[PDB]
């Protein structure tokens, strides 16, 4: 089917571009209904938890103000008593009662907790280290205690030993994020753990109540007696980062509470409204065209015309920039420049392959036709992800059903792109069996390709450039393809969509447009279609051209301009190929 | 049953029926339960935060829900692609040389889906290609 | 075969024979057995250049047809025929007028190279001076 | 400009004059110079010198300490609000490290790529 201008326009209409925008500020967690009612549980039972989701979400920031706003009992204050010399323990009273004992041991009872005797003989003895140790006190459970450490090492979180010289003594032992945590959240991330190497100790301070202050390599020290630990844990990371933690049990006991962010979120009026007040927030002057226009980039980041990236922190990072160019003004210009100046700042490698083609040192065709020829589109490696034509050949010979992949017998193609291989082949054969086993030797290359590639979305082009290849028929090269296949000949969804398509328009815009060129795509993926500008006026100007397609016999007749059947059709002319070469292998 | 109240839960004959069946199913054995008593204990945890501290077959039920739920961001994800085609799928009609089979996924809590399977014939000298393998 | 080509070198040959099968069906597969060798390589190399030369050389080994050893070549090839650019055009037309010089210039010798190369060519005063003579 | 980025030329460092130490026997490093401008490292020493996560917590969060030495005891720093631009320099090979990163993208928002060749024109000519 050809894919209309309207049909493919998915950017928000704006009216009054300059308004300035007003909204309240949405609560934290927005659209990420699964990561808060996780977390509220976790609250609600004193379970620990993990919030788990890919970087730039934002999920420290919402987790900080999400804590922000509970309340529990004054933490009790928080002490090191003396049970001896050489021995301490962690000790909880009630609230603000630790500046009162400590001059009541100061005449040197009540406070029923402080029992441990244990001092009780410096005159039985005139033997010539004693007062209490205040770690921390506060005057409220609103907030309750909030202590992020990013940095996980085992100083930071379980205190020190200072020595003022050697000896030591309880009153210089310094707290961690531990005891500053107690009673409240201590939150801490899972990839600092593991490259701090202190999930042990770690587990070792929630699974059995060991707190170790750190002591150095020099002379004797403390004991220092295991306290019952009172306070809940959130651990941040990627999905990747608690791959580590998740391969031992104790991880999964410790932290029963998943709290999951989307990568993305519904393309609603309630989101991009909210996105609107969440940015106010952050301290932007926006606008309504600067608001759509970041809102409908979130959607083109998600690749998806219904779904809007969920990462806060990026679309802030952007709309920075932006603020920069509108000169302090978040507007419809600044946001579509600063996309701009991204693109251009990263468009050496593009600049470069571009002047190659027009010098002729990359050869492809963007018009004509050739027969067992194809663009096919591929991705490059690197960010951000710039598609490009590589030209595809495909020849046929008389030989014992062989289809030849160059790339993957060379070692430069991947699993995936020796998988859609054999899919084709699958298709071939079983399509095509007058002769007994298909009599023909087929062999594929990428022309002018280096490098290792991967991935099932060339197999399209690949089986159309073979049916040309058997049946002698002439393809337009002025339109270039993607689509994966099955064996039954149906195309699937491919990835980067994108940036195939407007890859393919730059490299006819740098040619010089004429008029009929465009790209043959899964119809499977027309709802990740969020082409650029310029790409969406060409289609519209009629200068460019958008088919999708649900077979690869549709593609090869646009290609071909003819019809399968109807028979001065295509199917008879692969036939006859066949047959040519049927009777070629026989002397 | 007397486990769980001398570990302190208040526990209703619903809420241990409940949770004597989920052990079961843990077991994946109509026959056998789930020998893993800190396991059964950290979803009674759960259930009686949802109970309001009381562990009733509704609140059993519905920790199970929610860690369902917690856990089903992926299938989400594979769900919206199967109903936009973006995963290729049929539940119905009839195609010859298609069938849906089932695969677990990898990673916990190993949720189950359909991977549609093709299989061609053509004529050749008894082959049989696996072409994943 | 020996272990020193590369997988670039090895793509080359595949194209070339590609190229080879498809362009002479007359007979059904091709009816011959060709062997290339770089004869005096005791070192690993890799790249496409050599394709041009290659297929020349299996050409008129077909063909049995008289080559000029007086003109060098390099240029890689597509499964088409066509001739494409190569790295080092300079370095490579420079060493072989070196050799041609060292052996005594006979008037004729020179090299053959991909026309895609032609932006490339910034040859060094003695070369240019030798065409110019 | 500080070509060789290790932890107490970025950070500064303690002396302890015979032990104790205070306040004023604190150093400097370059983080402390550059406030109010611009510090340049080159991502190869980074990576190098094993100071690439101690510069994030640097950027990210504030935590910027003088180097001690393995003997007695010390200082509490308090991390400070970072004042200054920082140009990273090197080869896009040297940032591939760096890039795995999902960090450094975040940090190092500005990409700044120099043309290996430019065009050979009268202008270019003059202007070497
Ligand atoms: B398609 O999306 O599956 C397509 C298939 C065809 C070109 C062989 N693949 C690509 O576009 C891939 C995507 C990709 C990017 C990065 C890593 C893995 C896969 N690109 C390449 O294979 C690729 C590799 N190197 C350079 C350029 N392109
Ligand atoms: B069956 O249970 O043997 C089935 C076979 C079929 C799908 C090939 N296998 C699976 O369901 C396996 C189970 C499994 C899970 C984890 C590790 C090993 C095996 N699943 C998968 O193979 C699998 C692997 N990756 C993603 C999804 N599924």
Redesign the interface.
């Known amino acids: 089917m050809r894919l209309s201008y309207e049909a493919l326009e998915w950017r928000t209409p704006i009216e009054n571009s300059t308004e300035p925008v007003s909204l309240p500020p949405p609560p934290p967690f927005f659209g990420q209904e ?1 990561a808060r ?2 977390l509220e ?1 976790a609250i ?2 004193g ?1 620990h938890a993990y919030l788990v989701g890919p ?2 979400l934002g999920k420290h920031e919402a987790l900080l103000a999400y804590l922000s706003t509970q309340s529990v009992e004054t933490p009790p204050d928080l002490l090191y008593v003396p049970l001896s010399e050489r021995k301490v323990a962690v000790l909880t009273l009630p609230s603000g009662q630790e500046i009162h004992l400590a001059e009541a041991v100061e005449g040197l009872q009540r406070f029923p907790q402080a029992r441990a005797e244990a001092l009780r003989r410096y005159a039985e003895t005139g033997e010539p280290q004693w007062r209490p140790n205040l770690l921390t006190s506060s005057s409220s459970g609103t907030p309750p205690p909030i202590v992020y450490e ?2 996980a090492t085992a100083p930071r979180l379980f205190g020190r030993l ?5 000896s030591t003594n309880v009153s ?1 032992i ?1 707290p961690g994020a531990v005891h500053r945590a107690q009673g409240g959240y201590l939150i801490l991330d899972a990839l600092s753990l593991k ?1 701090e190497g202190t999930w042990e100790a770690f587990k070792r301070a929630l699974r059995n109540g060991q707190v170790e202050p750190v002591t ?3 002379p004797a020290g403390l004991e220092v007696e295991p306290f019952p630990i009172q306070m809940q844990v959130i651990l941040v990371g ?1 999905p990747e980062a608690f791959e580590g933690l ?1 391969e031992d049990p104790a991880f ?2 410790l932290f ?5 962010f ?1 990568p993305t979120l519904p393309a609603s009026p309630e989101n991009c409204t909210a996105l609107g007040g969440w940015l106010l927030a952050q301290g932007f002057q926006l606008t309504q065209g600067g608001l759509t226009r970041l809102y409908d980039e979130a959607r083109r980041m998600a690749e998806q015309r219904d779904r809007m990236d969920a990462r806060l ?1 990026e679309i802030r ?1 952007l709309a ?2 932006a603020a920069v160019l509108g000169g302090g003004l978040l507007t419809a210009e600044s946001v579509e420049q600063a996309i701009a100046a991204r693109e251009h ?2 468009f ?1 490698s593009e600049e470069e392959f571009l002047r190659a083609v027009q ?5 492809l065709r963007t018009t004509g036709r050739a027969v ?2 194809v663009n096919s589109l591929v991705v490059v490696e690197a ?1 951000p992800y710039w598609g490009r034509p590589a030209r595809l ?1 495909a ?5 014992r ?1 062989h289809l ?1 992949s ?2 993957r ?4 193609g991947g699993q995936i792109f020796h ?1 859609a291989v ?2 084709l082949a ?2 071939l ?2 399509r095509y ?1 007058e002769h ?2 298909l009599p023909v ?1 087929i ?1 594929l ?1 990428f ?2 390709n ?1 490098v290792s590639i991967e991935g099932d979305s060339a197999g399209l082009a690949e089986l159309v450039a073979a049916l040309s ?1 058997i049946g002698n028929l002439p393809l337009r090269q002025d339109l270039a393809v993607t689509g994966a296949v ?3 000949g ?1 195309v ?2 491919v990835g980067a969509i994108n940036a195939k398509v407007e890859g393919f328009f730059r490299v006819c815009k740098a040619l010089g447009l004429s008029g009929t060129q465009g790209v043959i795509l899964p ?3 027309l ?1 990740n279609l969020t082409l650029r500008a310029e790409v969406l006026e060409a289609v519209r100007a009629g200068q460019f051209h958008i088919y999708a397609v649900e077979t690869a016999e549709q593609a090869l007749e646009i290609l071909a301009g003819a019809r399968m059947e109807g028979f001065r059709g295509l199917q008879e002319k692969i036939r006859a190929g066949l047959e040519a ?1 049927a009777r ?4």
């Open positions: 699964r009612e996780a549980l609600r039972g379970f970087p730039s990013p940095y200072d020595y003022l010289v050697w210089l310094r490259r150095e390599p020099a990627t998740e999964s006991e029963r509470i998943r709290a999951e989307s922190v990072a920075e920039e700042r990263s050496l010098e002729g040192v990359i050869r067992g020829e960010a050949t020849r046929a010979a008389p030989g059903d030849i160059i790339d017998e060379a070692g430069l998988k054999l899919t699958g298709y054969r079983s069996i007994g086993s030797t062999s290359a022309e002018q280096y290849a099955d064996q039954t149906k699937l969804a119809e499977a993926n709802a070469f070629l292998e026989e002397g």
